[PDB]
């Protein structure tokens, strides 16, 4: 199904046919989505390889400019100058995600990230217990997992892990508690997680401990029971990403190989009768897509769910049909813990990502366009959170973290770049 948002996803220089150039990834995936008549007038970028953050700043500012460049079809001097471009461009950077290793994410690379117009991070987590990390020779600790994930949510950024069933070490049921425990213990409560079972690859360190017969990857009955069970218990402020990969069978040695392992894992909840209420399956363009019917507006609430996140507290605001379990649009407002940016203080809320669901083209179903923008939800969602955060906690300001090219939305509610943010005083 056709999105109004269209992702741009572009790799870092150690993709192959163009010499990793951002530009010309970017130009080429734009006019090859133009080509299909999807909409490129707003743009999610999506720097892929995980080391980004820690490349010499020159090449990261160098590397989203021409990004945006590609967008705004015109050159710039200067990173901030593509980024003023870009805020009234055609093709506008809505948001930006970077991928990182968790110990690759310090303040001074979240300060750098902001620098560059980031609104999300997605740390590669791959598992919680230090166990399996020491035992695949990973990287990073859980502890760089937990402390990186408090620094991002106090700097109002959006947070994404990477998650690996299967690895080395593991087990059915220990990864079912990796899951349950992601989600009920306040280190952890990222925003969205991206699941596929660990697979084995030549070339790798994983490779090389499934010769010695230390490992043996899960096959697909065992993670379809792990991803089905994990969907079960996702809450409903989580965001889940199709499960995939862009990863050919034909590279796979050993591991699950099928290419519709989420429709497998649909399958699989329906025989269980096992429900999923998390904002993929609820959002209004998936039910019309999957079940062909859309909200009741008789129906129609603003919802709230609070829960307590890397010693803060998370408020979850949403439009919902709540007769349907219909999810319209969603905003996540933070009372901060431990801020290190100069612009959030003790009496600021943050505002971590405004999303209303908009134009959808369902080629499968038959009312064609569908959208929910324009109707007012954003700005509901909006006002509540400056009500909550000025009359029940007290804040004197409010900061957004803003998608360069939606900084405008945010100037026409009265906000004002503050710092990396837009940002009003209550």
Same mark, same amino acid.
């Given at each position: 199904?056709?999105?109004?948002?269209?992702?741009?996803?572009?790799?870092?220089?150690?993709?192959?046919?163009? #010499?990793?150039?951002?530009?010309?990834?970017? =130009?080429?995936? /734009?006019?090859?989505? +133009?080509?299909?008549?999807?909409?490129? *007038?707003?743009?999610?970028?999506?720097?892929?390889?995980?080391?980004?953050?820690?490349?010499?700043?020159? %090449?990261? *500012?160098? !590397?989203?400019?021409?990004?945006?460049?590609?967008?705004?079809?015109?050159?710039? &001097?200067?990173?901030?100058?593509?980024?003023?471009? #870009?805020?009234?461009?055609?093709?506008?950077?809505?948001? @930006?995600?970077?991928?990182? =290793?968790?110990?690759?994410?310090?303040?001074?690379?979240?300060?750098?990230?902001?620098?560059?117009?980031?609104?999300?991070?997605?740390?590669?987590?791959?598992?919680?217990?230090?166990? /399996?990390?020491?035992?695949?020779? =990973?990287?990073?600790?859980?502890?760089?997992?937990?402390?990186?994930?408090?620094? @991002?949510? *106090?700097?109002?950024?959006?947070?994404?892990?990477?998650?690996?069933?299967?690895?080395?070490?593991?087990?059915?049921?220990?990864?079912?508690?990796? !899951?349950?425990?992601?989600?009920? #213990?306040?280190?952890?409560?990222?925003?969205?997680?991206?699941?596929?079972?660990?697979?084995? /690859?030549?070339?790798?360190?994983? %490779? +090389?401990?499934?010769?010695?017969?230390?490992?043996?990857?899960?096959?697909?009955?065992?993670?379809? +029971?792990?991803?089905?069970?994990?969907?079960?218990?996702?809450?409903?402020?989580?965001?889940?990403?199709?499960?995939?990969?862009? /990863?050919?069978?034909?590279?796979?040695?050993?591991?699950?190989?099928?290419? #519709?392992?989420?429709?497998?894992?649909?399958?699989?909840?329906? &025989?269980?009768?096992?429900?999923?209420?998390?904002?993929?399956?609820?959002?209004?363009?998936?039910?019309?897509?999957?079940?062909?019917?859309?909200?009741?507006?008789?129906?129609?609430?603003?919802?709230?769910?609070?829960?307590?996140?890397?010693?803060?507290?998370?408020?979850?605001?949403?439009?919902?049909?709540?007769?349907?379990?219909?999810?319209?649009?969603?905003?996540?407002?933070?009372?901060?813990?431990?801020? !290190?940016?100069?612009?959030?203080?003790?009496?600021?809320?943050?505002?971590?990502?405004?999303?209303?669901?908009?134009?959808?083209?369902?080629?499968?179903? *038959?009312? &064609?366009?569908?959208?929910?923008?324009?109707?007012? %939800?954003?700005?509901?969602?909006?006002?509540?959170?400056?009500?909550?955060?000025? +009359?029940?906690?007290?804040?004197?300001?409010?900061?957004?973290?803003?998608?360069?090219?939606? =900084?405008?939305?945010?100037?026409?509610?009265?906000?004002?770049?503050?710092?990396? %943010?837009?940002? &009003?005083?209550?």
């Amino acid at each position: 199904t056709i999105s109004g948002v269209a992702v741009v996803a572009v790799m870092t220089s150690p993709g192959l046919m163009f #010499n990793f150039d951002p530009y010309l990834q970017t =130009r080429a995936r /734009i006019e090859q989505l +133009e080509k299909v008549g999807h909409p490129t *007038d707003k743009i999610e970028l999506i720097i892929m390889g995980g080391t980004f953050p820690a490349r010499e700043i020159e %090449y990261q *500012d160098w !590397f989203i400019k021409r990004c945006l460049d590609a967008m705004n079809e015109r050159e710039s &001097k200067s990173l901030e100058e593509a980024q003023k471009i #870009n805020e009234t461009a055609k093709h506008r950077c809505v948001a @930006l995600c970077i991928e990182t =290793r968790p110990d690759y994410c310090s303040e001074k690379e979240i300060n750098q990230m902001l620098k560059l117009g980031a609104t999300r991070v997605e740390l590669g987590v791959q598992s919680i217990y230090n166990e /399996i990390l020491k035992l695949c020779k =990973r990287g990073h600790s859980v502890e760089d997992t937990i402390k990186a994930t408090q620094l @991002l949510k *106090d700097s109002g950024l959006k947070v994404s892990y990477h998650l690996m069933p299967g690895m080395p070490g593991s087990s059915i049921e220990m990864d079912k508690k990796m !899951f349950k425990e992601i989600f009920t #213990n306040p280190d952890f409560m990222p925003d969205m997680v991206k699941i596929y079972p660990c697979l084995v /690859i030549e070339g790798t360190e994983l %490779y +090389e401990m499934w010769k010695r017969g230390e490992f043996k990857p899960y096959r697909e009955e065992e993670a379809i +029971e792990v991803i089905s069970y994990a969907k079960s218990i996702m809450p409903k402020w989580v965001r889940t990403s199709r499960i995939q990969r862009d /990863i050919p069978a034909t590279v796979i040695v050993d591991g699950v190989k099928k290419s #519709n392992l989420g429709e497998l894992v649909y399958k699989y909840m329906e &025989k269980k009768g096992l429900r999923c209420r998390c904002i993929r399956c609820r959002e209004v363009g998936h039910v019309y897509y999957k079940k062909g019917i859309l909200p009741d507006p008789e129906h129609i609430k603003l919802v709230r769910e609070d829960y307590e996140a890397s010693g803060g507290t998370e408020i979850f605001l949403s439009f919902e049909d709540v007769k349907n379990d219909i999810l319209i649009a969603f905003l996540r407002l933070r009372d901060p813990y431990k801020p !290190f940016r100069k612009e959030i203080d003790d009496k600021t809320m943050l505002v971590r990502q405004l999303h209303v669901f908009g134009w959808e083209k369902a080629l499968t179903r *038959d009312i &064609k366009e569908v959208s929910w923008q324009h109707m007012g %939800y954003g700005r509901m969602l909006m006002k509540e959170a400056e009500r909550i955060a000025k +009359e029940e906690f007290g804040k004197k300001k409010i900061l957004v973290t803003s998608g360069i090219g939606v =900084r405008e939305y945010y100037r026409k509610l009265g906000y004002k770049r503050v710092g990396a %943010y837009m940002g &009003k005083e209550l």
